[model samples]
Target: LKGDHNIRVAILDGPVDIAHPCFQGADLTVLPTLAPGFMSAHGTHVASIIFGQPETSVPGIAPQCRGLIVPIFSDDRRRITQLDLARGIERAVNAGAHIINISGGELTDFGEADGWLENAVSLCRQNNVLLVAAAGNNGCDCLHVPAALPAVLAVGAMDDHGHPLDFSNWGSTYEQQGILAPGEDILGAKPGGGTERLSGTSFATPIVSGVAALLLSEQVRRGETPDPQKVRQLLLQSALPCARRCLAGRLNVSGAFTLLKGGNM
Candidate 1:
């Protein structure tokens, strides 16, 4: 259950099972107020991948980093509006979150950078908060909002074999993405209780966020305040190149941590 202590990541999603063993002693109090049933199981799964404790069947990328949850959307399981997402992003940034993991996206084609989601991404970038988002599960060429916007780290899903998931959307545009992470049949905590196997860019987004936390923690341990741009470079450049895939490359936690320790930042 022990890990690098300096990293802190925020999850903007649904209610997490606070009492879950995997998240024991982890901070779950810093959350945004959400309207009453809008909370879905998706967020819990994503959080588990990023911060869940190592167990017999499941392991998180950065179990030692603190987790912050921010709930948007309403209780009726209704779709969250761009305005709500923007407010959630602002809250997470103001809360001093080093990394924000978003596991949701919209399907509408609202053109480029002309909506609330784009505004949210811009604000996060302005504050130097790393925004990681799921690239959507539609398996289409259409870019998902927020993830499709500039300055946002959009993640695509990869299977156990390290290939892009069949259901994941892909793009070559710089504004459309950054990397890919394990998503297909990934093991993580379920919302109602126990564990579940899930797939999607939603599941993949947290892997990158968790890595960001680890890198930041390393920098802090070395008495260094890592620049946001440096962190981004370290992450992307240190990734395992995966040509012929959807994204630029696959996430490499060990490589990234190694670079940070070497002061490659």
Candidate 2:
């Protein structure tokens, strides 16, 4: 159950520590536009969840998929402005990424994306690229830009029990476009070749992105053209039922796979 080069995912977060042992043999490229900055633990953790090689402590969900590191955050700054996010998105899209994973956001009164951010999302849609984003970690009914955008797949955190985590944000737009995934105590690669257990919507976002990559890679394996929109629909339609205000429900990876393979669930 691994991905292939048919899938390329752009990680728009902090710069990754490619020298880490877990990334050995990984199909990854570190692209830096800004000045050289130190590696970010948060970005490394998120990238490991999607691109870390197998047989390592942090085996990634789509270990074989191509990874592009498009940093929007560095070691000192954890916050990402809308403009920076937009630039990262455009760069990822231009780099021919099939899926872009953004595990950060900014809280707002309404889940509104700024002009630049909105245009970048539009570019992905125009190019048939899927953008997966974090639903925010406010632990309340609030909206985060880009995640609230209807076209992007907004991901929220769920605990081991399949229940939505208290810290996962939910809002009106999320009800239609958001989904939940494992986020509590999730193990991911950290800097210096170590592993750490972290929790947040940021971690949950990469899970969805990884699954999307696997699905698209499966399509490619079958010699069919990959359809990002179709995979997005399958994930939403096959999701398991959940409690009220839990967004579209919890992610059902197996269910989506079944539907993708033309088998009934």
Candidate 3:
């Protein structure tokens, strides 16, 4: 089922090519004044993962949900600084996004969250919006700035066999809040009309974010006040167990649904 009309998912990445066929019939709002450029494949693909319409080559996880596209990275593909990402996060929060999906991150050595990103993340917590981020793909026990930040749901990748991908990063903080999800060869829309296979924690982050939107939609359908904190806790608490370096565990969508359905809240 498509997500509820009230749900808004913000994609904090490169510019999205909204004119693509896969985005047909989807409700999307582009925040950046600039249009899609030559190096927008990453953002386009990530957006399609969550909002691609049905019957398209890359059907999305929650096509009916409203989308807010905040272009954090430029067409030059230059490194995205914390200030740029922070501004994007602030804009999304100010634009009334319920959930934000960040499919990119910067690797950090000491696992510290600081400056603009820290402030933006705090803003989300204050506003009650769930922030999902990609754990870096350094293949080591490292941390990404936004992902490592407290209260942010960090995502790591897994293969078809449910094994953690070698490139997925994990650490002490991630072991507590991060989760593993399918990321290998995920099919997503390209800038044009075609689709492509891609993999990484970048791709897996949206799966969790999309499911969260659906859960929040269910809450709305049930006449309950949508609580992103509850959704985040339930998702982490319901994850299936995994081996070492796998973060919290593999994501258990069914388990989370069951828990939510059975609860008295």
Candidate 4:
């Protein structure tokens, strides 16, 4: 995401520790940008994976892109619903986010959104704003909501070595076609000033989001408005073959960048 000064990525999850050292000079919209102390490290970790500064080691994937925080869940101790997430998505898109990162999922009983949430997803798709989310970690017969929504790019977890993690959920359902990425034992910023090793499809979602930023950056550098459809297609077509977990393949930023730069199918 080199010099992506004009690209904006939105994170919809728990409260982020925006004051953390890793967020040094980043532009942000923290939790309650809806209030409740609403504190948690989940958002912090997810955002760090996308834009944390270099000292954090994991160094963000698309550090040059600015981030928009659409905090839907604040305290991990509390629960959230599909409509709540739909509102967050609407707010983020209306705020001018070109890409959205949704690492949160709904409970099985909570059910998917046929009205509010689906409407939000349809709006985003109509605007050509790509939605990137995580496949659940339940290792169940299927994936979870939001992530399971067809309009969202659902990601699954794999080790840094490229093996699918045991905890990752999978299926080829409508919104659940999965893309495997390095999520297991990932190093990302915590709520504290330092960093920690965290795992789950949650962290993997941002990696894909970062690559999306890079693809968009390539478009901007070429003096073109970012096309979400092309960005989405490039990401899918560029994935490298990996373990038996991906619908297309494992995430491949390098390959995707080449396609965007060369402008060849």
Residue 127, candidate 3: C-alpha displacement in angstroms: 1.0
Q: Which 10 consecutive positions of candidate 4 have the poorest summed lDDT?
A: 32-41
How does each model score on lDDT?
A: 0.71, 0.85, 0.85, 0.75
lDDT of 2 by residue, 64-178 (tens): 9999999774334555566777888898988989998888778888876679888989898888999898988888888887788757898999999999999889887888888
User: Per-candidate TM vs. native?
Assistant: 0.87, 0.94, 0.94, 0.89
- Model 3 alpha-carbon miss at residue 4, Å: 0.6
Worst 10 residues of 1 by lDDT: 32-41
Question: Model 1 over residues 58-144: C-alpha lDDT tens digits?
Answer: 577788887788877556256666777787888888887878888887754632645676777787778778888777777766567
| Tens-digit per-residue lDDT, 144-180, candidate 3 | 8788887889999999999999999977788889999
Error of 2 at 95 (Å): 0.4
lDDT of 3 at 137: 87
lDDT tens readout by residue for model 4, 97-184: 8899988775353335568888998888888888987777777656577766656787888887887788887655522245788887
All candidates: CA RMSD in angstroms? 3.0, 2.5, 2.8, 3.1
Where does candidate 3 clash, by residue pair? Answer: none
Residue 213 lDDT in model 4? 89
lDDT for model 3, please: 0.85
Positional deviation of 132 in candidate 3, in angstroms?
Answer: 0.3
For candidate 4, the clash count comes to: 1
lDDT winner, 1 or 3: 3
